[PDB]
Design a binder for this molecule. Structure first.
Ligand SMILES: C=C(C)CCOP(=O)(O)OP(=O)(O)O
Ligand SMILES: C=C(C)CCOP(=O)(O)OP(=O)(O)O
Ligand SMILES: C=C(C)CCOP(=O)(O)OP(=O)(O)O
Ligand SMILES: C=C(C)CCOP(=O)(O)OP(=O)(O)O
Ligand SMILES: C=C(C)CCOP(=O)(O)OP(=O)(O)O
Ligand SMILES: C=C(C)CCOP(=O)(O)OP(=O)(O)O
Lengths: 304, 305, 305, 304, 305, 304
């Protein structure tokens, strides 16, 4: 026989995962792990299953960062070069998408038919969020705040929800924790939008105001653009995708003149109050008091 | 009362997400994976309702793979028309393709077959393993051996051929193993494609002159030509240059003729076709009915070689 | 004794300043604004000495506007020859054009007409208002409505048509108002131009294939095609891409045929021509002599529609 | 009727003036206003007419900056991004040229036929100066100092002269103030050439030695090039339009080695002496002593 | 025992170093410097063994000079095929060419002629002096006079013509001075080349349409055209733009016809050929045998003028 | 006669040498001059001949820098702009290659037939070294350490050897000093490789880690790449030719994790011991003790 099939080797896997492993070697904050831990106080998934869920979520998170940095044309990630500036965009993109299917193979280890459907629905939502974000970015059409939050719910919220939905599929309690975790994912993204423009640690981690370089209609940027439609400086800056710090500093000063950062702090305050009220409701109906989830809520909105 | 109210996904939003995908589906193709499915169905006799799901799944995945491949290769034309990302941009075209990978998975679940998910995942894993090794060689400028190339092709082009027939086997009541045959057909198909990309007027019209050279790809005849004289480094350096210019590509093409790499490639395809026919005859001698359709697909895919 | 002595402007320096302008004037054009002036002069009978100043002013302004337009649109060809800034650079071509705007103003003063300056200024103001709105839509990727487009065209293309006839009226002894007619003729002229840019071999030779697409312009048929199916976003995304490639432009052209946008455009031009002829007949019925020349200009500018 | 003409709206005007209004929102030094005020001590134009003249000159100045920054491919203006790096070059250019005709409409408010001719002649001179400057820049041909001053007289001098010529057209005194104001405009431009290469505030406002990046044959650059024609480093640096600070610092050091900054200080000294002598002559022949115009002369040459 | 052991240079490494050089030598040329050598050998009768070394030295240097010239000029085609640096990159092509300059020097030493090294060095010095002045004018956008241009050509193109015949004279037993004649032939050859680059279909196929314009070169007819009307600056500004576009080049070509620069160039070539024939006849009248071959080379190099 | 040949003028020579003279006006360290002086203690070449040799070596050194900076696409040289960023690559390249033949004309002044052959052989070796270095760089194929040292012996070693071989051709002593000088040239290049990545003065002189920007397989880079072939981050960084300091700092940190700088220090130590042993051997066999050559050895490896 002319052709003889070879088994896949560890050396080849190491090539395929080159970009993924590079990113995993960079220290992150591990918010999603602490979120899983805080929900497990209530759901009490055993560690055998929980370890699979934690691995799945870490894999999907790192892979999504690989792809996001390419689609956004970012330069820094966790204060280090983005993976594709080392390995090129094609290998980094292929590595991220590969890991999406390695993670599905990992979910299959739960031997839980509902978990498969949960995974598919979440990967569908993730791409629906990325697709609408890109659509607005490329068309230079500023979404409303309500459209933006629906996109965030699909995107950033999709992974938060995936983690807790898999936990629920591995527990017999009949309480719906997803509205709460979706709310926490929305809070987390709005804080991220804010800190991208205001936090010095975020300047060290990704560059100054990198959402402006990337042309993104983020939460405070939307508010600023829509607060004065007759002034088109900020949306035109987005169009220009500026790498220059002078343009970005001018944009940041414009956004303070429209009070878009106080606006964003006030919305986060309102959503945190809803989150606390939801936690208190869950506990009033039979769940033990959960200190860890209050600490996660406080931590993600620590600034602001 | 909640500050945020989740909205349902709408048809208008789906139409945005599928903009690049719908664009590519509106361009007429050769629909050969459908003829392959039909020719194996002569033996497997999958019920119409399951077969329609498999055909849809394979069509979706094929188009989605084309969206992504054209981006990763920086192609210009697809089916003689602009590549989708030259209309929608690379980011939306890439996202649309990967989106469809998961819509197709949702479609696969309609078979309600406990084995179907693992089959799908194993195939998507193979597809990415093949693409990743091909990009690895391209970017490092390291020419694989022919054997390494065929293992990569088996993963890549073969992975979707194999997915179609593996789902059909999972849905059929007979237990014959058709996968070694279909993987061989996928390899033949890809080598023929490598040849036609460089030596076919129809492919020049559909994808540009010798576009594998522009993309820097170590394709089957290119590997042979590079390795037949390692002291001459013109061809591998042309690959490095990723030329869009027809003059460099015509020179490279003339060099590959000088190393007799197209004869070499035709001879390999002939040997593989002979193995394919022998395998088909073996399957028929052991019970299966004579399959004219699968011989036509084999004759069709190697027509110009 | 002064350290600095002011020198007089010289012919050699003027020749430098007008390098781009003289280049464009040496390229044969259709000289249709001169036929328009002549056809309205059948009615207005401006004395030869004043008419020569107006003809010169309008020629100067037209060429200068072309210098600037080709830069702002990033055009490549003009009258089948290189755009002036691809010889002299954008900065000198732009400065030469804006220079001529003020040389033409100096020429206008030779009419010694107290009203002529205001007429000139109002027209240059309209011209910049039209160009500014067109650039605004182009850069923001926001498709105007047809009504917004025509208001912009009325300012832009119409502003110079109107300037010619408004100066002629100011210099004539009759008080008939010809401006609504000439603004209508300017709109017809521009819509015909939008059509011919996409669907005329002579325009392909003079400015390139479908150059409005390369420039990203929301022209009359392009607006119709975009708005006829807002769920398909291929055409507006092609505009965003500013394609120089003929394959994308041919696809866009084929899409616009599929939305029936050229029939739509021909039908609009037919209605506007009917209004123009009715207005002409109204002017003649109320005293003015029958004007064959103005009917020929109307027939000429819409010939291929 | 198929087409109905719409009136121009305030929203559309706000679009057309987007780039102009952006620049006007950036604080300048207001030299031309203080120049007008110092000459009005002698010309005593009433405020109704003077307000029109001041508005016209401000409009033309800001519009000329919009266009100059595009033609020069500048990056900063008054320490902020150039207007075209926000709005793009086409809209910024159209906005500037639009304002040239809005300013002519403003001049018409004087109902002074001579003022129209003065405006046209000055806009003609302005473009003659810009055209010769660009011609030398693009052809890499170093003008003589005398050619450079003729160009400056047309360009920078054209607006100084416009302001005072409009004032003279609104006054009955029969004294010719234009030779003096032209001299002040030449002094102002030579100081500007110098400060572009030597002043730290100018480095903050436009970047380090931005005349080198722009390839301009400015007053000290001409002197340095011509002081040693056998050394072609500086003219070749101009050709390269360097954005790198290392090349610019090397060029600046070369220009000090040719004593081009002392040369420029000495010329400014000689011209200031002529300016003072001209002022004293005007006053000896019947005009009151003008302290303000001496302060303007001192201020524009304060450094140097 | 030493940590480092020096290895001998290998054939495989030489093959790498000469990759760009061997590529260019595999492309058929006109081999006119070989006909020139043969035609002067009718008079000089250099022994075969020395003549073979000179022929090899001149071939090596010519190809090496082409490698470098194509890089310095940013050329695209050479002998109708891709320039070597568009395959191997500029750095390896440049290094390979300069390498061969010193391999040729090693070859020259085989003549064992005490004068040969100085002759070689003086010629390489002249070659670089000519290239350096040509680049100086190109980069500074300063049009030389015709006399300055010819001095540069005498250094550049003439330097290798002169090297061949100077080595032949050094190896021959007669003392006749042929260098003024051969330098004149080198000048004629270069002016003809300048003309054919702009006005010859064979040169369009071998190097592209009017490639001297793309390269920004002040060639013989271009100098004439620029200087015949210094108030028109279109042509020198086109040189500045280094146009790859055929439309700009066709316009420039049409402008040069309008200044009658090709007639001017043909007339100059005619005068120089007349001087060359008179010099040849003078050499023959004073003893040398009638040389048909050198008249054929002269007729060949000016054939199309 | 239609054409009259002109003599070459000093003004034209000044044009041809523009880039060369620019580089010569920048202060270097003069290692090769001190090397020649230290060997002359033994060879005692008279100053008339030695002055020619010193001039030849200086010329070839400066010319090689001109060309290397172009082929490497460097940005800084001796802390100043590379010559081609002023004069353009074509004139700078032509000037360097011109000087190669001016130096050969200078060598002819020795009227020493062996000196001509020595010069040719060294220029041949120089190009053989540059050619193999470029071959590996462009093909992304990491040489072995032994291949790298053979290339260094041809390249950097070729000029060291040329200097001392010309000295030997002008002396009657029958001792072979070339193995020693070749060893010193190898030591010098390995120190240069190291200091390019580790010395702050080298950061000021050429930029941070400029060998990474240039894609060069230098001595410590080779060791790091080959120490872990399963990790391909560093070779992929070389492929990317990064101008970004973040990527370069990441690469530098990777190379410390593979101990490639300690490895390089240890090799230099071993070679210096061989150099000292070779010097001691030459002196044991009849040569006077040479303090200067020990100081040169100490100085070139001063760091490390
Ligand atoms: C936080 C988690 C789950 C792990 C680290 O990722 P990063 O901290 O770097 O990224 P974000 O969570 O801020 O998206
Ligand atoms: C042939 C099939 C399955 C459908 C059309 O796709 P294409 O013809 O364009 O692409 P390939 O099958 O050649 O990969
Ligand atoms: C027709 C006139 C007035 C003169 C020639 O200009 P062009 O023909 O080239 O340009 P348009 O009139 O079509 O705008
Ligand atoms: C000085 C005036 C008239 C107003 C501010 O303009 P700028 O100060 O910023 O610019 P220049 O006068 O220096 O040209
Ligand atoms: C003519 C000779 C000496 C050999 C072929 O080289 P080319 O024909 O390609 O180049 P030129 O001689 O025209 O310079
Ligand atoms: C050292 C010598 C011979 C002279 C100065 O050159 P540089 O010091 O700048 O360059 P390298 O010797 O480090 O190569």
């Amino acid at each position: 026989s002319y052709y003889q099939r070879s088994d896949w080797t560890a050396d080849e896997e190491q090539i395929l995962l080159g970009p993924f492993d590079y990113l995993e070697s960079l220290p992150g904050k591990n918010m999603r792990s602490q979120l899983i831990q805080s929900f497990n106080t209530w759901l009490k998934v055993p560690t055998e299953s929980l370890d699979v869920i934690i691995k799945v979520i870490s894999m999907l998170h790192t892979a999504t960062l690989l792809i996001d940095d390419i689609q956004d044309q970012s330069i820094l990630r966790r204060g280090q070069p983005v993976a594709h500036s080392i390995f090129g965009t094609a290998q980094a993109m292929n590595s991220g998408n590969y890991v999406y299917f390695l993670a599905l193979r990992e979910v299959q280890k739960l031997q839980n038919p509902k978990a498969i459907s949960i995974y598919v629905d979440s990967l569908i939502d993730l791409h629906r969020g990325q697709g609408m974000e890109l659509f607005w970015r490329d068309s230079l059409m500023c979404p409303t705040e309500e459209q933006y939050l629906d996109m965030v719910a699909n995107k950033t919220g999709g992974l938060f929800c995936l983690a807790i939905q898999l936990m629920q599929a591995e527990a017999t309690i009949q309480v719906d924790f997803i509205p709460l975790v979706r709310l926490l994912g929305i809070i987390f993204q709005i804080c991220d939008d804010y800190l991208n423009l205001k936090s010095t640690a975020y300047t060290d981690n990704k560059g100054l105001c990198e959402d402006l370089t990337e042309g993104k209609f983020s939460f405070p940027i939307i508010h600023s653009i829509r607060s004065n439609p007759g002034n088109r400086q900020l949306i035109n800056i987005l169009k220009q995708k500026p790498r220059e710090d002078d343009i970005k500093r001018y944009a940041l000063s414009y956004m303070e003149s429209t009070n878009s950062f106080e606006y964003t702090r006030g919305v986060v305050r309102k959503l945190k109050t809803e989150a606390i009220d939801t936690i208190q409701g869950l506990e009033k109906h039979g769940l033990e008091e959960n200190i860890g989830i209050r600490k996660i809520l406080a931590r993600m909105s620590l600034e602001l």
